[model samples]
Target: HASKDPTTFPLGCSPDITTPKKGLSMELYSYDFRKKGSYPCWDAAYLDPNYPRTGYKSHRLLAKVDGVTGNINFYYHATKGCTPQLGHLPASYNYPKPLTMTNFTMLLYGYFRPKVTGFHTFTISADDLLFVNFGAGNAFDCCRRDSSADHFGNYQAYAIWGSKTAKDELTVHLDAGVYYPIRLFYNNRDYHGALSFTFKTESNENTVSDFSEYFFSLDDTEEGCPGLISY
Candidate 1:
């Protein structure tokens, strides 16, 4: 079940005053749900009010769940935005090298219900340049997709991370009826690419019915880079 209010929920965990003061250059936030001991869980949120305008014109977020050594496990869902960038390329650039890129708008969605007992950990990070102007959807075309479509809307990108250890298990519980998509891009000329997503969760059930995956692909030849001039 989904919580009616996110603010009142266990999101944000505990604030760490040391990060902002340490002069690490990058802002860091920590959530400690394990502070209460065993079987304790916490929810957290990462926000950047001044994103694109700031130095982090592009970012990447990563989430990792640890501590499981037995049957215990963790799951999560996510979604993100797909930006698009076009440019001319010189003949010297690789035409088909499978370019790879990572974006921050991607969301991660899924659930984790450890079957065993022990200490567990989950970590999320926002990192890299995924794209220039892509939207949420199963297709690369931004024409029909809207930033707000459905639970599986085209506006959000998602990914999942899990582990099967018991001692360090972290489970992500996603709400019912909501789904996310995975965003990706590859350019043959420069061999450049991008990716991103948001993470979400589902119920605590342990069955294949509880899992799903989505993917997208594009041809640089068919969908030429916007501003590139072929030399």
Candidate 2:
């Protein structure tokens, strides 16, 4: 058989690498806001049933290594009656219609090197979205080393957003190699709030293998990466 030869044995050589199968197999992680004073309403229209009920806003979205050729899509919809209030606002009882919007993000991370280098690309198509921003950042001492504030470490980011009549798509060219943590921030100004994320494996050309999770926090504290967030 072709599988039983000493020379034909699968050894140190790279095996036939292919994309991952279609199905939701990745994990999702989120910071716990209950520890403070927030509670996530799962009954909200836009919340995915697969996610847990916690008041930690969606941030640091990560995926497992899935060698696929299709793009992984993330849908971020504002909860009903939830207005975009960054800091503070007068306590009011008047509620507005729940504004809903969707966005997309992708991330690439692993121990092995990528097939190509420099200028990675991504596309976005959605309605009622304010804008999209994508960027990369390196962690020092596992993202703990803080030097001169702006000179924390090597990081690259790109952002673009505006009013468009139709679906909008943008391409980004970034330096490849050295596993990078990527993020796409989707903002809905009319509603108030944002969806930030990271990617693992997307597309039908690669197989899902070993990968890590992404993380973030509302207080700006390091919580951890993305994965399955259990109660």
Candidate 3:
């Protein structure tokens, strides 16, 4: 059963804050229920806002992982039912412990400061559900697939099952030296999961795979990185 609120939740098991403060903070939430026909467990895991911490069966805090500046990709299958052409899928984000491969969701949060200002293109492809949000406000709260759409704006999108080849693109003009809040929510219902997120500047697209350099920790008070305010 899910908890009622955040105040009563325990914090002792939460991931410790890193000393230097790099990359984004993440939490893995697992559910006892499996995906069934017409069931929206994946949607509730992230879209519900309270689902990750207060509305899930169990959750564990993960160490800070890489930021959303480059070609970030991950894929995993407990039974090795599916594989990606890109290569091996490693949860190399300082995963201190192991996670159940089925019916689990991961939430990544941090602030992004671009080195170069101007328009940049973001492309995402996944086997299941993958959502990203930029700027202020809680990304989880407003990350809905049925909302209005924009070509070059703060992008929010998802990938359904069997839509691996269909890529969703978003071009946005981000300013340099401004720390913008960002969040990525991923849910793997069953069998296997694959996700690919790439960022391309007008100049070069190939060299931007590892964009963790511009990533900042959400706990940085000096940088004025704000927490998820409303949720």
Candidate 4:
């Protein structure tokens, strides 16, 4: 599945890759986006939960090699699934589809090292599935299924929303310039999909945090190339 657009990610080799089950409008944008964050990019991993990694695998295997930083120029929905909403690809795949086929697993790992020590607010608007690790061993992993953060206001979230009864906001004090190690895992099961995220000082509104902002630029690009990706 090749894409006609240059900036768009082509449907690469993945066991579950196929013509989208149906055409989904990719024009959805953050309706009331009112914030910004210091996360320049995410250290990401795309996993086919149907086919787990083989022998000799570690969390390091989930990251891309050196010198490859997947950067996001603009945050927007590019495809119905598995495509990078932003321009660049992630850290551990030969392909550029960050949100993939049904049941496709995505792991985003990086240090949420802030520039100041204070309370921070994190919010997310996603459909179907999302899991976030906000601090040292604290996570909101089940906003869809009966697991983590699904109950909203948990995981240090100040607010909870959406019909799934999930936690969409978090307020926590993070030290200045320290590695907070933030990780997010999302799975798009057999349902509609979407995601919107923002983080700010506990005193501000929601904003889009991209490369040009106050966020960190430690982009780990996905140059690991290919494994069991099915087209």
Candidate 5:
């Protein structure tokens, strides 16, 4: 399931679809979920006074608990200030209730093994500062600011935006027969957080799920891209 989308909700098109009540950016997903039921999964982390995979809390880690069982997963980070949901752990930021405020980072980790090999294209679109990292086994915990982590890899984010249709992308040569780890690090340095991810391959020979066990999604597919899956 996606770390920043609704797990399950009423689905449809044209007016029947709806976006989440939280997050900073509004360009994510730009799609909708067309199913109405309960899902089983989540993956996220809590960070503060520190950062990175090595610098995070475990109150939120959904993927390890519920890997995407299907090809379409949905998740949303905050509901109403610090109250997490979807792939995020259903807990508080360890603060005083009634009159309290929290400031911590949110992390979404996992691996992605694409279906087609060779010249695979990956895109990470988001706002409020997003850091995408990939390592062996598509491990999301490999590197954050380490450029040499990929080893002979070219990584850069074009149209890097903190407020608009800001986006970043990378292309890598991956062997279809194996798996790769992926790390999606985002820090909403302050107000407004939003994100959406996609990848294009020279070959659509097989389902993407074949590459990685994780799947993710949007709502109403509204204000969303056309690549989202509905079901």
Candidate 6:
């Protein structure tokens, strides 16, 4: 399906083109945090065993692409003026329409194949909560609260100071031509939220954000583009 907004991704495409795409695959599950009867906080919605497992609102073949170096911005609540517009489309797809804003859990997973082998440090910032894990694990493992961070490359952070976001770092040594397993989990609590992820290495003085080339996912089978639905 074609989107009325030029900025939004169109629905449907050949799995041949998307499979083994050069980017991370994203699965987003939304919840009505305001629905006190159902759930009161982001954690409650997230920890629910049946959640995300039951279904998903959006499934991006390539949430973040290679060849582009910049922060992977996942955000929501534009009118109140939160983060960048980069993730608004996904947020628009997941956010429950009855309310102005709601909670959403995003899962990004793929293999990271670095061209330059060295110690790499990853920095992640979010308005709510975030967890990053390295090595082998599926999306379900990434979403669980019990998941642990790698001694060097696993990190968890949350928002603080009202609207101010919080950040943490994860460092690991990667070899060139090797596909390393990586996964990320993030969710927003209230009002508005955004996420920023970047990395730095000993050889580079500045942090790098574009990961289109570095990130790749194995899932190529696609029924269709993830659709919009009520939480």
Best TM-score among the predictions, by candidate number: 3
TM-scores, all candidates, are: 0.20, 0.27, 0.61, 0.43, 0.42, 0.56
Clashes of 1: 89
Which residue pairs clash in candidate 3?
none
Query: How well is each residue in 1-231 modelled by candidate 3, as lDDT tens digits?
Result: 011112111111111244324666665665434334435333344446545334543554433344323335776645633211112325445454555555566676665556666666667776556666665432321222112112112335455565553457556666665555556667665556677766776755553556567555544333332323222
Per-residue lDDT of candidate 5, residues 17-50 (tens digit): 3332211111111111223342311112222323
Worst 10 residues of 2 by lDDT: 1-10
Model 3 lDDT, residue 163, Cα: 59
How well does model 3 score by local distance difference test? 0.49
Worst 10 residues of 1 by lDDT: 20-29
Top candidate when judged by lDDT against the true structure: 3
Model 3, which residues run further than 4 Å from truth? 1-20, 35-72, 78-91, 138-155, 163-166, 220-231
Residue 162 shift from truth in candidate 1, angstroms: 26
Clashes of each: 89, 33, 0, 25, 32, 9
- Candidate 3, residue 38: Cα displacement in angstroms equals 11
- Tens-place lDDT per residue, model 1, 1-231, is 011111111111111222111100111111122233333122112223233223232333222221111111112121322222233211112122211221122222121222222222222221222211122222222211232122221212222222121111123322221121122211111112222222232433323321112111222222222211111
Q: Where in model 6 is the C-alpha error above 4 Å?
A: 1-20, 36-44, 47-71, 75-87, 90-102, 137-165, 219-231
Per-residue lDDT tens digits of candidate 6, residues 1-231?
022111111111112333444666655555444333433333344434333333234322223322222246655554433212223433322332232233556666656666666777777877666666554332212222133222223132323314454667766665665555565666665557767778888787987777767776544222322212211
Ranking by TM-score: 3, 6, 4, 5, 2, 1
Order the numbered candidates by lDDT, best leading: 3, 6, 5, 4, 2, 1
lDDT of 4 at 110: 35
By lDDT, is 1 or 4 better?
4
Candidate 4 Cα outliers beyond 4 Å, as residue runs: 1-103, 139-162, 203-208, 211-231
Q: Estimate every model's Cα lDDT from 0 to 1.
A: 0.21, 0.25, 0.49, 0.33, 0.34, 0.47
Tens-place lDDT digits, model 2, residues 147-170: 211211222232323333224333
